[PDB]
Amino acid sequence: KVFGRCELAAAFKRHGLDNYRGYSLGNWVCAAKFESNFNTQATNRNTDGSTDYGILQINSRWWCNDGRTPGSRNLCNIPCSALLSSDITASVNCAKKIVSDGNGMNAWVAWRNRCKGTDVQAWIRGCRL
Numbered sequence: 001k002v003f004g005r006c007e008l009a010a011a012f013k014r015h016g017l018d019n020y021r022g023y024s025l026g027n028w029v030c031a032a033k034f035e036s037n038f039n040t041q042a043t044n045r046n047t048d049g050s051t052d053y054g055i056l057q058i059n060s061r062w063w064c065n066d067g068r069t070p071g072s073r074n075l076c077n078i079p080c081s082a083l084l085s086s087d088i089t090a091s092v093n094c095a096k097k098i099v100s101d102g103n104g105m106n107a108w109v110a111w112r113n114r115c116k117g118t119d120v121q122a123w124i125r126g127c128r129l
Contacts, residue, residue, distance in 0.1 A: 001086035003038040003055070005029065006127035013129055015092040021099050025129075026120030027111065032056060033123070034110035040091075041084050054083035054091045056108070063094055 003011070009029050012018065018025040035057040036042035044052045050061040050069045060069040064080035076094035083091050098107050105111045 001040045008032060008038055009124045009127050009129060011088055017092060020096060021104065023105055024120065026123040027105060027115060029123040030115035030120050031108050031111040034114045035108060040086055040088065053080045055088055056091050056095050058083050058094055063098065
């Protein structure tokens with residue numbers, strides 16, 4: 001499923017992401033935009049053999065199990081395919097654990113390079129929230 005900007009903002013809010021760990025909603029929407037272009041089905045393989053899954057591009061080396069990443073830890077206790085669902089609940093639950101891991105949203109390279117220090121509020125402007 002490819003989410004609409006305001007649609008995804010509303011889902012993220014309903015799931016308790018707005019200001020979770022100090023990160024306002026615009027940060028999460030901006031991260032989704034550049035990580036997956038709002039597509040729940042996005043996958044991207046990395047040079048180390050791991051693969052990123054879903055709307056927030058969660059990595060198979062630490063967070064989920066895809067059965068093909070030697071030494072994966074699966075900290076979110078879920079098969080990576082669950083992160084590709086139109087229902088973003090699993091992606092949100094896992095992201096909450098990632099952002100709480102110590103590095104905050106810096107865990108997402110696209111956030112760090114394209115969202116961090118920008119006017120992230122622009123991402124929810126015009127939405128009925």
